[PDB]
Structure 1
Amino acid sequence: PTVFHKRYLKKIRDLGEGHFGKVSLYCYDPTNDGTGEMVAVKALKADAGPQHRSGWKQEIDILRTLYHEHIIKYKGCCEDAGAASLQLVMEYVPLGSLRDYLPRHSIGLAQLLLFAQQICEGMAYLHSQHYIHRDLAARNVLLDNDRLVKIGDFGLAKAVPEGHEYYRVREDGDSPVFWYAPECLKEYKFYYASDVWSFGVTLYELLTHCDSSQSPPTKFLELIGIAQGQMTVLRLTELLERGERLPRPDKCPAEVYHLMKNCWETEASFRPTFENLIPILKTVHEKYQG
């Protein structure tokens, strides 16, 4: 609903670049005085195809209507005359992603489980609104403060059709395969249960403190190798079907690894839902707290 006027927008620094977009930090100062606001602005590249351009308007409308404590706050839009589309303005989350934060801040097991619980609440809310995320990874989880986390990007999020139980994807070149369930890699079908698999991977990233050497692409690529031709995705699919999984992170409890392994059930219907995971993480969080 809210409209940002370009004349009060001052660019500070680039924050990141996703699949089809770019996020930059801006100062929104309607004066020049100290009552300034810092804003995160998502812009689609002016080169983006007609597929991404229609998908962009849908993403804007998705953030315009999602309202939850563990979802980044939509602020408004402004005309991106330079790209003929709009720019998505959101709140600026100063501590960045868990992928950015965790490698430098040794966070305790208790806070990590609180974050995992918060991602589940945000994801159960998203699923309640009949949307699938399709890009749940630690790089998309933003740190508001030491005790608050928010899902910060919806670049691949899609409305699940009323009658259907899944969304048909048709695999691209930028798909985050190392976060995907076998049904996604194989049948090009994304279920609500496919987001739970990606959550399991996010939970693994968190328990490894987002260590780049322990990362899902790093670990899976060690299990597949790099002389595969066009076959990385096939070898990944066959390893996941043989029951090979990401290892137990150093200092990760056995029960948390078992929960991770449950989000990684090959059969999608055997996975818990985000609604089921909330009481479980709540309870597992209360335990490690004391």
Structure 2
Amino acid sequence: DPTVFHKRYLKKIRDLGEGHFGKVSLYCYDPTNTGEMVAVKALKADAGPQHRSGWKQEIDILRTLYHEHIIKYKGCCEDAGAASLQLVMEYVPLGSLRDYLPRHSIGLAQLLLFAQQICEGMAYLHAQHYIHRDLAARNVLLDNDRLVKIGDFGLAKAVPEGHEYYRVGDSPVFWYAPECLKEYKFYYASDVWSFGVTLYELLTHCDSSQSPPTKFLELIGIAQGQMTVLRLTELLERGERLPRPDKCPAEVYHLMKNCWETEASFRPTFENLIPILKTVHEKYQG
């Protein structure tokens, strides 16, 4: 059953973040009056046809998802001037792990709990026959209780019923498995590769000097898209991998490497990752 927010009662507070197709801002929704704080995401200015269709897909997908570790869809708002809907979501005031981790002292057990929660949301997503396609620390958000909420479903897709992959502008190539780069196939297992990269980001505390783009660009250089993807594919097929983060346990690095098996069918499922991460979280907790 639909929920409609009325622009007449939305009062902008501040900007929060920029995703693939939309910008997110904080609003007070006050049909009285104070009222509820909500996040509102709107189609970016100068959006072309391809962007409007991506944006429509994002709203359609998020409208169907309902889980403790997926950012909560609240409703939509019409913007008649844009001829487009605006997406209203819960407000999660700690923002993304990309912005949070560099600014706080966080232990290994906490990082592994974040990872477990990411796997729980992703196991749910895959249950529902969607792939995310940009599973990266920038898109993992934290609520006031530091509970993980996966966000930015801008690239997400329904995997055609009867299949284990979706056949695929600017892609987040430094988070992508070789089959995505080379075969233009995005499997459920391709999101698991991306999770491995995200886990690497968590263990490096989202330090920019250690980031996946920094590490790969050191080897590939700035180049055109096609050349970048070719060079990246070659490195990955030859077994090149992101290094073990300082202070990362051997078994946690082995977990990353398993998520980065070149052959997709050898990677763990998100369902299996849940108890694996639970186990290592408890181990390093006490």
TMscore range, shorter length: over 0.9
Query: What TM-score, normalized to structure 2?
Result: 0.96
Structure 1 residue 2: Cα displacement:
0.5
Q: Aligned partners of 1:21, 1:110: CA distance in 2, in Å?
A: 33
Identity over aligned pairs, percent: 100
Structure 1 residue 39: Cα displacement:
1.1
> Does structure 1 residue 192 correspond to structure 2 residue 173?
no
Structure 1 residue 230: Cα displacement:
4.8
- For each residue in 1:217-262, what CA deviation from the matched residue of structure 2 results, as whole angstroms up to 9, or x when unmatched? 0111112233678512111110001100011011111100000000
The answer to whether the Cα contact below 8 Å between 1:248 and 1:257 also exists between their aligned partners in 2 is yes
> Does structure 1 residue 234 correspond to structure 2 residue 230?
yes
The answer to whether the Cα contact below 8 Å between 2:175 and 2:197 also exists between their aligned partners in 1 is yes
The answer to whether the Cα contact below 8 Å between 1:46 and 1:84 also exists between their aligned partners in 2 is no
Q: Aligned partners of 1:146, 1:66: CA distance in 2, in Å?
A: 21
| Secondary structure, counterpart of 1:54 in structure 2 | helix
Q: 1:246–1:261: structure 2 CA closer, same or farther, 3 Å change rule? A: same
Q: 1:229–1:95: structure 2 CA closer, same or farther, 3 Å change rule? A: closer
The answer to whether the Cα contact below 8 Å between 1:76 and 1:88 also exists between their aligned partners in 2 is yes
Of 270-279 and 20-29, the range deviating more from structure 2: 20-29
Superposition misfits of 4+ residues, deviation over 3 angstroms:
226-230
Contiguous gaps of at least 5 residues in structure 2: none
Q: Aligned partners of 1:30, 1:40: CA distance in 2, in Å?
A: 16
Q: Aligned partners of 1:136, 1:116: CA distance in 2, in Å?
A: 12
Q: Aligned partners of 2:179, 2:42: CA distance in 1, in Å?
A: 31
Of 221-230 and 20-29, the range deviating more from structure 2: 221-230
The answer to whether the Cα contact below 8 Å between 1:4 and 1:76 also exists between their aligned partners in 2 is yes
Q: Aligned partners of 2:36, 2:164: CA distance in 1, in Å?
A: 41
Structure 1 residue 46: Cα displacement:
4.7
- For each residue in 1:76-124, what CA deviation from the matched residue of structure 2 results, as whole angstroms up to 9, or x when unmatched? 1010122101000001110000001000002110010000000000000
Structure 1 residue 11: Cα displacement:
1.2
The answer to whether the Cα contact below 8 Å between 2:22 and 2:55 also exists between their aligned partners in 1 is no
| Secondary structure, counterpart of 2:154 in structure 1 | coil
Q: Output the aligned Cα RMSD.
A: 1.4
The answer to whether the Cα contact below 8 Å between 1:97 and 1:142 also exists between their aligned partners in 2 is yes
Q: Aligned partners of 2:146, 2:52: CA distance in 1, in Å?
A: 36
Q: Aligned partners of 1:72, 1:226: CA distance in 2, in Å?
A: 34
The count of corresponding residues between Structure 1 and Structure 2 is: 285
| Secondary structure, counterpart of 2:153 in structure 1 | coil
The answer to whether the Cα contact below 8 Å between 1:19 and 1:174 also exists between their aligned partners in 2 is no
Of 137-146 and 256-265, the range deviating more from structure 2: 137-146
> Does structure 1 residue 19 correspond to structure 2 residue 15?
no
Structure 1 residue 52: Cα displacement:
2.6
The answer to whether the Cα contact below 8 Å between 2:94 and 2:146 also exists between their aligned partners in 1 is no
The answer to whether the Cα contact below 8 Å between 1:46 and 1:82 also exists between their aligned partners in 2 is no
Q: Aligned partners of 2:200, 2:264: CA distance in 1, in Å?
A: 19
- For each residue in 1:186-216, what CA deviation from the matched residue of structure 2 results, as whole angstroms up to 9, or x when unmatched? 1111000000000000000000000111111
| Secondary structure, counterpart of 2:225 in structure 1 | coil
